[PDB]
């Protein structure tokens, strides 16, 4: 029985941008335990409803280690929506967002849905990346952008639901 | 080299053509394999967590039982 | 024509190399994907138990207070 769709999503980015909390907040875990640190992969499921239908989201969170290079391509290649995630507390994370965009373009599929996620937006006092400058990156590359806080719990649920709507609207187009 | 270029361009045309066909074939079984590894690992992770959670849910209410008594000792 | 001869074999020889190099990779995949699967599965297995271990260590000790630190209540 239910669900009646399955979107496969991916979280990618520099380590310590807080990719992994951003997940853990969406999937609603009560706990901190993860294998990201040690292994470099972790995974979470959440079904949501959008305009009435069940939508199973499989969310992979990748951390680059070259150790599992092959497997993590498999995730790129098979991913329906991927979130690029920087820390607004840290520039190079933001600078690299281009670099990742490479990978995504190079390792991943030709129509994939894409979303730049500016994380930790709550800690403004340590804020090196202007949002304005954030949006411009996004607009340049014609992709959606969104500022987020895994800890204040800001826009994480919206970031996903937004990406999930974007995936579905595309698929419903191929009726 | 008119019959040499009219002939060889048929070989090397078929060449890219053979591999083209060979390319879609090789990338096809890579995707197919990747999806099987996706779901295999999706399952392993799910359970791997599932277990650990229950290891923690207990450590939760045993130490929570302790703070239910440990505070009333410290209170006095 | 003159320069038009060097722009085809520069790109066609670029071309057939491209695919031939593509397969070398795609060929090695099934093996790698599995060889990795194993490594992962172990790693998954290893860290999962080790995680459950810590949560049990602390389920006993935390409970210890229930026997030894309740006996302290019993002794006072």
* Interface contact C33-A71, CB threshold 8 A: yes
Candidates A38, A71, A74; nearest CB to C47: A38
Burial class (CB in 10 A: 0-12, 13-18, 19+), A156: buried
A6 touches chain B (CB under 8 A): no
DSSP secondary structure letters along C12-49: HHHHHHHHHHHHHHHHHHHHHHHHHHHHHHHHHHHHHH
Fold entry, domain C1-76: 1.20.5
Experimentally determined by: X-ray
Q: A1-175 domain in CATH 3.40.718.10? A: no
Largest CA distance in chain A: 48
Contact A122, A152 (CB under 8 A): yes
> Which residues are within 8 A (CB) of A152 and not within 5 positions of it... i.e. 6 or more apart?
A122
Q: Specify the resolution in Å.
A: 3.0
Domain ranges of chain B: 1-76
Residues C63, B30: Cα–Cα separation, whole Å: 51
Cβ-contact A33, B59 below 8 angstroms: no
Closest CA to A101 of A144, A146, A147, A141: A141
Which chain A residues have a beta carbon less than 8 Å from that of C29? Answer: 70
Q: Which residues of A touch C40 (CB under 8 A)?
A: 39, 41, 68, 71
Domain residue ranges in chain A: 1-175
> Which of A33, A73, A74 is nearest residue B52 as measured by Cβ atoms?
A33
Counted residue by residue, chain B has a size of 76
Neighbours of A152 (CB within 10 A): 13
DSSP B1-41: -HHHHHHHHHHHHHHHHHHHHHHHHHHHHHHHHHHHHHHHH
Distance (Å, whole) CA A29 – CA A24: 6
């Amino acid at each position: 029985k239910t669900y009646d769709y399955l979107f496969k999503l991916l979280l990618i980015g520099d380590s310590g941008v807080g990719k992994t909390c951003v997940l853990f907040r969406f999937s609603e875990d009560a706990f901190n335990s993860t294998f990201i640190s040690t292994i470099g992969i972790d995974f979470k499921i959440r079904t949501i409803e959008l305009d009435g239908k069940r939508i199973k989201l499989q969310i992979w969170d990748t951390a680059g280690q070259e150790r599992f290079r092959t497997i993590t391509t498999a995730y790129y290649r098979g991913a329906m929506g991927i979130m690029l995630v920087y820390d607004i507390t840290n520039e190079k994370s933001f600078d690299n967002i281009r670099n990742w965009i490479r990978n995504i373009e190079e390792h991943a599929s030709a129509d994939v849905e894409k979303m730049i996620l500016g994380n930790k937006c709550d800690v403004n006092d340590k804020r090196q990346v202007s949002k304005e400058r954030g949006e411009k990156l996004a607009l340049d590359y014609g992709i959606k952008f969104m500022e987020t806080s895994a800890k204040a719990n800001i826009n994480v649920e919206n970031a996903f639901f937004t990406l999930a709507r974007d995936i579905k609207a595309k698929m419903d187009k191929k009726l | 080299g008119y019959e040499r270029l009219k002939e060889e361009l048929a070989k090397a045309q078929r060449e890219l053509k053979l591999k083209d066909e060979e390319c879609e074939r090789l990338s096809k079984v890579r995707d197919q394999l990747g999806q099987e590894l996706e779901e295999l690992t999706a399952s392993l992770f799910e359970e791997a967590h599932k277990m650990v959670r229950e290891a923690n849910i207990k450590q939760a209410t045993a130490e929570k039982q302790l703070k239910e008594a440990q505070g009333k000792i410290d209170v006095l």
